[PDB]
Amino acid sequence: DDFVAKLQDNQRFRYNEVMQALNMSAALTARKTKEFRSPPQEQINMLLNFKDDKSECPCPEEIRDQLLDFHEDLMTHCGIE
């Protein structure tokens, strides 16, 4: 619940931030505005790729840290750790 609430808020913020640069950059509509045009499943697919260190995921550090902590807690509960 709260993870996707924060993720949706930040995605809306990023969208409304980039909309000012739409007139500034013509290629932007082909290079940067890809997540907003991407299929909804594949949007969260890159949004949840802050796993490992590939780090192409457009997710801020705090939102990444929330899920990183929750996943460690889940592994500890499952006994994997």
Binding site: D1, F3, L7, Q8, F36, R37, P40, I44
Partner: protein
Amino acid sequence: VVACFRMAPLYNLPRHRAVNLFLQGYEKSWIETEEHYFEDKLIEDLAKPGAEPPEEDEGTKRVDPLH
């Protein structure tokens, strides 16, 4: 025009739909990819005669759990 190029985005999707999506994405991206190595220790524990000779059977060797 811009709306046509866009599809429905996540921030416009309802919370429960986005939650179901996130559950599936988390399952495929994080849970499945997570790997833990337990096979060798599990097989060793199963193969161990669990104090079977200390256990007084006075008979043929009892089969270990792996057996």
